[PDB]
Assembly symmetry: C2
Homo-oligomer: 83 residues x 2
């Protein structure tokens, strides 16, 4: 038993860098956040990095994307680390 539901917030590296501040406001449901990175690599960046957050229970994951006021510039994508 483990269930490690995570989400991918894609949008910008500067928006996600300061997004962690809002995650602190809702820590009761937030667990940890990954370092904003980018899918693959061609030469540098282009305003489009996704970070991997993680919660404790599956209900805490859906509550995060439906409770904290995430920035519209970013986009939450269901995820499942299963680890």
């Amino acid at each position: 038993m483990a269930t490690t539901p995570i989400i991918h917030l894609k949008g910008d590296a500067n928006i996600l860098k300061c997004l962690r501040y809002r995650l602190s406001k809702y820590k009761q449901l937030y667990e940890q956040v990954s370092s904003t990175w980018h899918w693959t690599c061609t030469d540098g960046k282009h305003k489009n990095a996704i970070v991997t957050l993680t919660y404790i229970s599956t209900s805490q994951r859906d509550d995060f994307l439906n409770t904290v006021k995430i920035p519209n510039t970013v986009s939450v994508s269901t995820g499942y680390m299963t680890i």
Copy 2:
């Protein structure tokens, strides 16, 4: 229907950077690889970055970690982007 099985190869940023070369040898089952990043961030790095790979079918995921000779320095962890 989608099933996007992915794996996390944690170990080193230099070992994972050159690991992509081996992934090319087995592209028939490999699909795409993510940019080696690090879980969270305290100040810099410390030889421990994880990359997110992706396959086409679930059977292709288990075959990747059981077919390509991955480096022992790294570690494959089951993953499920579900996206």
